[PDB]
C-alpha cells in the first residue's frame, strides 16, 4: 500500500536552569527507526530498527549533525517566541515540529507536510501546494513574511519531493522483511457478565501492524453505537498495536451481535460472533 516517513521534534524550555530538553524521533509508517534525546548519554542520533543499523558511519555522523542543528533552531525559536508573545523568562514553553512525505502504492510522491506548534497550538504550517504558509496568528504572520523572503518553502518542497521520498524508498527496500509485511490482527471475543441478565461482549484485535484499524459492532446486521465503548489504538510495546470495542447486551441475546474488523493485512473484513 501507501507509505510515509515522518520526523517529530519537541523542545521544552527549562527556566530554572540550563537549555531546553530536546527529543526527536523518526518513523517509517508506524515503525520508530531513529531517536535523539538531549538527556541521553550518546549525544548521537541512535538506531531503533535493525534495518537502519546497516547504514555506515557517514550516515550516522550526518544525521547527528543535522539533528543537533534542529535542536539549536528550536532553542533559538523558544527565545524568539517568548519575545513575540511578550512572555516572562519564568515559565516553561514548548515548541513542536513535524515534517515528512507520503508515497502511493507505486512508491511515487503523494504529499508532503511541515508544521510547527508553540505551546500545543498551531503556529505555522506549509500548505499542501508546498509553496505557501498557513500562519495561525499575528506572531506567525511575522515568521511567514520572513520565510517568504528567504526561499524557505522552495528548500522544503525540494526536500519533501526529492530527498525525503528517495530515502523512504531506500528504507522500504532495506527493511522489506518488516516494513512491507502487514501483521493482520489476531481477533477473539470475551464475555463479561455485568448483572444476572446483561453482559459485556468485548471484541479484541491484537498484535497488528500498521496501527490503522476499524472495529465496528452490528446488531441484526445494522451498525450499533448505543452502549458501545471503543478504546484508542494502543502500542503493545513490541512494535505492534492493540484495540478493543465492547457492547453491553441482554444475556441470551449474544448471537444477534457481530464485531466487524477492517485492516490492511486482511483480504476481506473479519466477522466475529460470541459462541457459547
Amino acid at each position: 500500500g501507501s507509505h510515509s516517513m515522518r520526523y517529530f521534534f519537541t523542545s521544552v524550555s527549562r527556566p530554572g536552569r540550563g537549555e531546553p530538553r530536546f527529543i526527536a524521533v523518526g518513523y517509517v509508517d508506524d515503525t520508530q527507526f531513529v531517536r535523539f534525546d538531549s538527556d541521553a548519554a550518546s549525544q548521537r542520533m541512535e538506531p531503533r530498527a535493525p534495518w537502519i543499523e546497516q547504514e555506515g558511519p557517514e550516515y550516522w555522523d550526518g544525521e547527528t549533525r543535522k539533528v543537533k542543528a534542529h535542536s539549536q533552531t528550536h532553542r533559538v525559536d523558544l527565545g524568539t517566541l517568548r519575545g513575540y508573545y511578550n512572555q516572562s523568562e519564568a515559565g516553561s514553553h514548548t515548541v513542536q515540529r513535524m515534517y515528512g512525505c507520503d508515497v502511493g502504492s507505486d512508491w511515487r510522491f503523494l504529499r508532503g507536510y511541515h508544521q510547527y506548534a508553540y505551546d500545543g497550538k498551531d503556529y505555522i504550517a506549509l500548505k499542501e501546494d508546498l509553496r505557501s504558509w498557513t500562519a495561525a496568528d499575528m506572531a506567525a504572520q511575522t515568521t511567514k513574511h520572513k520565510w517568504e523572503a528567504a526561499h524557505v518553502a522552495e528548500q522544503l518542497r525540494a526536500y519533501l519531493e526529492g530527498t525525503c521520498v528517495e530515502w523512504l524508498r531506500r528504507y522500504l527496500e532495506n527493511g522489506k522483511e518488516t516494513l512491507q509485511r502487514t501483521d493482520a490482527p489476531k481477533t477473539h471475543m470475551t464475555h463479561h457478565a455485568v448483572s444476572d441478565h446483561e453482559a459485556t461482549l468485548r471484541c479484541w484485535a491484537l498484535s497488528f501492524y500498521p496501527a490503522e484499524i476499524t472495529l465496528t459492532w452490528q446488531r441484526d446486521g445494522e451498525d450499533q453505537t448505543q452502549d458501545t465503548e471503543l478504546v484508542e489504538t494502543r502500542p503493545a510495546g513490541d512494535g505492534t498495536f492493540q484495540k478493543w470495542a465492547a457492547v453491553v447486551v441482554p444475556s441470551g441475546q449474544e448471537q444477534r451481535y457481530t464485531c466487524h474488523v477492517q485492516h490492511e493485512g486482511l483480504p476481506k473484513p473479519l466477522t466475529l460472533r460470541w459462541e457459547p
Binding site: 539549536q72 533552531t73 525559536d77 513575540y84 515568521t143 528548500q155 525525503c164
Partner: peptide
C-alpha cells in the same frame, strides 16, 4: 534522512 534546512522563526 533529516532535512538540512534549519531556518529560524
Amino acid at each position: 534522512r533529516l532535512n538540512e534546512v534549519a531556518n529560524n522563526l
